[PDB]
Design a protein around this nucleic acid. Structure first.
Length: 95
DNA sequence: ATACGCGGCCGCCCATCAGAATCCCGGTGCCGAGGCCGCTCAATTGGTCGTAGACAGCTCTAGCACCGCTTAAACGCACGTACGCGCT
């Protein structure tokens, strides 16, 4: 049949996590995927840009790390890094 | 010819039977997590090769600092004009 994949499974549990027996319209659901896919290119594209400025050829986590910092304002940014840094840190701990 | 009787009418308080209306319990429809699921094609798994890029060595630009002769530019103040802004 057709494809047209989306992030619907990811957005839904997140909302469950923050009000479990709280609801949503089928119109705000796409707004959400539209919103995510939009932020996706915003961050990953910028990573691509720096990589081939100061003369290197792969994109790691550090770059995102840097990228994120100047893409967003002071207070959210730090918490965001923190969360980000740990999630992965744990990831490696396992293996 | 002349006087007595009364008759249903009626206001009265006083009695009976049905209807209206509030409270004691209700069914119904809408919304949103759930479950079920299944054919399957994208991620994961185990695996090879090679190449970017970390890293250490090196040298070799240019960013810093610092100074003093020179002076243009900033400063602060004095005076009034011609706008900001208030009213009608």
């Amino acid at each position: 049949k057709t494809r047209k994949e989306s992030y619907a499974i990811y957005v839904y549990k997140v909302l469950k996590q923050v009000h479990p027996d709280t609801g949503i319209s089928s119109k705000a659901m796409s707004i959400m995927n539209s919103f995510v896919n939009d932020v996706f290119e915003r961050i990953a594209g910028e990573a691509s840009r720096l990589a081939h400025y100061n003369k290197r050829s792969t994109i790691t986590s550090r770059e995102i790390q840097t990228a994120v910092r100047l893409l967003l304002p002071g207070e959210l940014a730090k918490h965001a890094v923190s969360e980000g840094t740990k999630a992965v840190t744990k990831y490696t701990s396992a293996k």
